Amino acid sequence: SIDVKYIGVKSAYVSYDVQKRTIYLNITNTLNITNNNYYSVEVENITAQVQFSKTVIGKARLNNITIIGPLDMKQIDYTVPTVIAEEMSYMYDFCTLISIKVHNIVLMMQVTVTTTYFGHSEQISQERYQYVDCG
Amino acid sequence: SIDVKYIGVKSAYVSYDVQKRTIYLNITNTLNITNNNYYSVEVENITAQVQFSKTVIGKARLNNITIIGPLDMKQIDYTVPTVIAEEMSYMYDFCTLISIKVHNIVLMMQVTVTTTYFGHSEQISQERYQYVDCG
Amino acid sequence: SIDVKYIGVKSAYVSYDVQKRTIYLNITNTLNITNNNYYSVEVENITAQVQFSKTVIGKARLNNITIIGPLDMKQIDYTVPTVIAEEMSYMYDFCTLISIKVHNIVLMMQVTVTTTYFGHSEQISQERYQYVDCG
Amino acid sequence: SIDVKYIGVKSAYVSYDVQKRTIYLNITNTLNITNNNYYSVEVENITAQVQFSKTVIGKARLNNITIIGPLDMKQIDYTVPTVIAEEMSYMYDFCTLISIKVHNIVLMMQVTVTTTYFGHSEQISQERYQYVDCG
Amino acid sequence: SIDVKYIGVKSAYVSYDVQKRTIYLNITNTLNITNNNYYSVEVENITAQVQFSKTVIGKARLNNITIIGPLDMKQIDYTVPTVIAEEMSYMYDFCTLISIKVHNIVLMMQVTVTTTYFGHSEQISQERYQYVDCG
Ligand SMILES: *[C@@H]1O[C@H](CO)[C@@H](O)[C@H](O)[C@H]1NC(C)=O
Ligand SMILES: *[C@@H]1O[C@H](CO)[C@@H](O)[C@H](O)[C@H]1NC(C)=O
Ligand SMILES: *[C@@H]1O[C@H](CO)[C@@H](O)[C@H](O)[C@H]1NC(C)=O
Ligand SMILES: *[C@@H]1O[C@H](CO)[C@@H](O)[C@H](O)[C@H]1NC(C)=O
Ligand SMILES: *[C@@H]1O[C@H](CO)[C@@H](O)[C@H](O)[C@H]1NC(C)=O
Ligand SMILES: *[C@@H]1O[C@H](CO)[C@@H](O)[C@H](O)[C@H]1NC(C)=O
Ligand SMILES: *[C@@H]1O[C@H](CO)[C@@H](O)[C@H](O)[C@H]1NC(C)=O
Ligand SMILES: *[C@@H]1O[C@H](CO)[C@@H](O)[C@H](O)[C@H]1NC(C)=O
Ligand SMILES: *[C@@H]1O[C@H](CO)[C@@H](O)[C@H](O)[C@H]1NC(C)=O
Ligand SMILES: *[C@@H]1O[C@H](CO)[C@@H](O)[C@H](O)[C@H]1NC(C)=O
Ligand SMILES: *[C@@H]1O[C@H](CO)[C@@H](O)[C@H](O)[C@H]1NC(C)=O
Ligand SMILES: *[C@@H]1O[C@H](CO)[C@@H](O)[C@H](O)[C@H]1NC(C)=O
Ligand SMILES: *[C@@H]1O[C@H](CO)[C@@H](O)[C@H](O)[C@H]1NC(C)=O
Ligand SMILES: *[C@@H]1O[C@H](CO)[C@@H](O)[C@H](O)[C@H]1NC(C)=O
Ligand SMILES: *[C@@H]1O[C@H](CO)[C@@H](O)[C@H](O)[C@H]1NC(C)=O
Ligand SMILES: *[C@@H]1O[C@H](CO)[C@@H](O)[C@H](O)[C@H]1NC(C)=O
Ligand SMILES: *[C@@H]1O[C@H](CO)[C@@H](O)[C@H](O)[C@H]1NC(C)=O
Ligand SMILES: *[C@@H]1O[C@H](CO)[C@@H](O)[C@H](O)[C@H]1NC(C)=O
Ligand SMILES: *[C@@H]1O[C@H](CO)[C@@H](O)[C@H](O)[C@H]1NC(C)=O
Ligand SMILES: *[C@@H]1O[C@H](CO)[C@@H](O)[C@H](O)[C@H]1NC(C)=O
Numbered sequence A, B, C, D, E: 001s002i003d004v005k006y007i008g009v010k011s012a013y014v015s016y017d018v019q020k021r022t023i024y025l026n027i028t029n030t031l032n033i034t035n036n037n038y039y040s041v042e043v044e045n046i047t048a049q050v051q052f053s054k055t056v057i058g059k060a061r062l063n064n065i066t067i068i069g070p071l072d073m074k075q076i077d078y079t080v081p082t083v084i085a086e087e088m089s090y091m092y093d094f095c096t097l098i099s100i101k102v103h104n105i106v107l108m109m110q111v112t113v114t115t116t117y118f119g120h121s122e123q124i125s126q127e128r129y130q131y132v133d134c135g
Helices: none
Strands: A003-007 A010-019 A027-041 A044-058 A061-068 A075-079 A082-086 A090-111 A114-134 B003-007 B010-019 B027-041 B044-058 B061-068 B075-079 B082-086 B090-111 B114-134 C003-007 C010-019 C027-041 C044-058 C061-068 C075-079 C082-086 C090-111 C114-134 D003-007 D010-019 D027-041 D044-058 D061-068 D075-079 D082-086 D090-111 D114-134 E003-007 E010-019 E027-041 E044-058 E061-068 E075-079 E082-086 E090-111 E114-134
Touching: A003 A010, A003 E010, A003 E114, A010 A027, A010 B003, A044 A114, A044 B114, A082 A090, A090 A114, A090 B114, A114 B003, A114 E044, A114 E090, B003 B010, B010 B027, B010 C003, B044 B114, B044 C114, B082 B090, B090 B114, B090 C114, B114 C003, C003 C010, C010 C027, C010 D003, C044 C114, C044 D114, C082 C090, C090 C114, C090 D114, C114 D003, D003 D010, D010 D027, D044 D114, D082 D090, D090 D114, E003 E010, E010 E027, E044 E114, E082 E090, E090 E114
Parallel strands: A003 B003, A003 E003, A010 B010, A010 E010, A027 B027, A027 E027, A044 B044, A044 E044, A061 B061, A061 E061, A075 B075, A075 E075, A082 B082, A082 E082, A090 B090, A090 E090, A114 B114, A114 E114, B003 C003, B010 C010, B027 C027, B044 C044, B061 C061, B075 C075, B082 C082, B090 C090, B114 C114, C003 D003, C010 D010, C027 D027, C044 D044, C061 D061, C075 D075, C082 D082, C090 D090, C114 D114
Antiparallel strands: none
């Protein structure tokens, strides 16, 4: 990635910024800019490219063959019980929260068993993340 | 990715910004800009490209063959019981929340068993994320 | 992706911004701009491209063959019981919520068993996300 | 994607913005702009492209062959019971909500078993998302 | 990655910044800038590239063969019970939260069993992260 940028407030090439009651008197501004950008990116010179796979099975006996890909949960037990019993009481609850499984950003590109890959793969994530603001 | 940008407030090439009761007197501004951009991106020179796969099975005995792809949950138990019993009480609940499974952004491009890939794959995610604001 | 941009408030090439009771006196502004952009993107020079697959089965015995693709849930139990019993009480509930399964953005491009792919694949997601605002 | 943009409020090339009771005196503005854009995108030079697949079965015995594609739920149980019993009480409920399965944006392009693909595939999603606003 | 940047507040080439009630008297500013950037990135000169794999099984007996990919949870038990019993008491709860499993940013590119890869792979993540702000 030639250019990746996270800029909180302001991005600018040339900035003349006059803010909060300043006095802007005699100013002469002369700006002369020559800017040229040449992008030669990902050019590929390829005569011959071959992806080839072959499988042959002969005179074989196969019994109880198990192939299981990734990300298996099988048996998971989530027990979160809450019991509140009050005879004569004063109970004030402000900003109370219970969260079990929260997923914001899930990116999965290639999950497989057998993968043959020629090329380019790029993952870019930018965020501002604030979970809980109260009071 | 040649250019990826997250800019919170303002993005500008040339900015003359006059804000919050300033006094803007005699100003002369002369701006002379020559800007040229040449993008040569992803050009491919390819004579011959071949994707080939072959499978042959002969005189074979196959019994109990199991192939299972990824992301299997099988058996999951979610138990969240809530019991509230009050005889003579005062109960004030402000901003109370229960969430079990929350998914904002799920991107899956290639999930398979057998994959042959020639090319380019790109995933880009930008967000501002605020979950809970109260009070 | 040549240009990807998230800009919170304002995007502008040249900005003359006069805001909140400023005094804008004698100004002369002369702006001379030459801007040229040449986009050569994804041009492909390809003589011969072949995608070929062949499968042959001969004199074979196959019994109990199971192929199962991804994303299987099988057995999932969601139990969220809520019981409220009040004899003589005062109960005030403001901004109370229960959510089990919430999915905002689900993008799936290629989920398969056998995939042969020549080309270009791109996923781009931009959002502003605020879940709960109350009070 | 050459240009992807999320701009919260304002997008403009050249902006003269006079807002909130400013005094706009003698101004002379001369703007001279030459802008040219040339888009050569996705041009393909292809002599011969062949997609070919062949399957032959001979003298074979196949019994109990099961192929199941992705996204199977099978057995899912959703139990959310709510019981409210009040003898002599005061119950005030403002902004109370229960949601089990909510799906905003579901995009699925290619979900299959066997896929052969030559070309270009692009998914772009932009949104502003606010779930619950009350009070 | 030629350029990766995290800039908290302001990024600018040339900045004339006048802020918080300053007095801006006689100034003459002459700026003459010649800027040229040439990007030759990821150009590949390749005559012949071959990815080839072959598997053959003959006169073999295979029984109880198990291949299991990564990320298996099997048996996990989450027990978080909460019991509150009050006879005559005063209970004030402000900014109280319980979270079991929270996942913000999950990026997985290639998780497989057998992978052959020719190319370039890049993962870039930028964020500002504030979890809990209250009071
Ligand atoms: C500078 O500004 C003052 C105002 O205080 C003015 O009297 C004077 O003529 C100005 N000079 C020039 C060169 O603009
Ligand atoms: C502006 O810059 C260019 C460079 O391309 C130069 O030829 C020209 O003389 C400059 N003009 C002034 C007034 O400085
Ligand atoms: C690569 O491109 C050039 C022209 O840009 C061409 O002359 C040459 O024949 C190409 N390569 C092959 C292997 O054809
Ligand atoms: C295959 O496995 C099962 C249990 O998973 C077992 O009962 C069976 O006997 C096995 N096959 C052979 C041929 O032993
Ligand atoms: C500068 O502004 C002042 C106002 O205070 C004016 O009297 C003067 O003529 C101006 N000078 C020029 C060169 O514009
Ligand atoms: C503006 O810039 C160009 C560069 O292309 C130059 O030829 C020209 O002389 C400049 N004009 C002035 C007034 O500086
Ligand atoms: C590539 O393109 C050039 C012209 O741009 C052409 O002369 C050449 O024959 C092409 N390559 C092949 C292998 O045909
Ligand atoms: C295949 O597996 C089942 C249980 O999954 C088992 O009952 C059966 O005997 C197995 N096949 C053979 C030939 O053993
Ligand atoms: C500048 O503005 C003042 C107003 O205060 C005016 O008297 C003067 O003639 C102006 N000068 C020019 C050069 O416009
Ligand atoms: C404006 O810019 C062009 C560049 O194409 C230049 O030829 C011309 O002389 C400039 N004019 C002025 C008044 O600066
Ligand atoms: C590619 O395009 C050029 C013209 O742009 C043409 O002369 C050439 O024959 C093309 N390539 C093939 C293999 O035909
Ligand atoms: C195939 O599997 C079933 C159970 O899934 C089992 O009852 C049967 O015996 C198996 N086939 C053979 C030939 O063993
Ligand atoms: C500038 O505006 C003032 C008003 O205060 C006026 O008297 C003066 O003639 C104007 N000058 C020009 C050059 O427009
Ligand atoms: C405007 O720009 C063009 C560039 O195409 C230039 O030829 C012309 O002289 C310019 N005119 C002025 C008044 O600057
Ligand atoms: C096929 O599977 C069923 C159960 O799914 C089983 O009853 C049957 O015996 C199997 N076929 C053979 C030939 O064993
Ligand atoms: C500088 O500013 C003063 C204002 O205090 C003014 O009297 C003077 O003429 C200015 N000089 C120049 C060269 O602009
Ligand atoms: C501006 O810079 C250029 C360099 O390209 C130079 O040729 C020109 O003479 C400079 N002009 C001035 C006024 O310094
Ligand atoms: C590498 O590129 C040059 C031109 O940039 C070319 O002359 C040469 O033949 C290429 N290498 C091979 C092995 O073809
Ligand atoms: C590489 O590209 C050059 C032109 O840029 C071309 O002359 C040469 O034939 C290419 N390489 C091969 C192996 O064809
Ligand atoms: C295969 O494993 C199972 C238990 O997983 C076992 O009962 C069986 O006897 C094994 N197969 C053989 C041939 O021993």
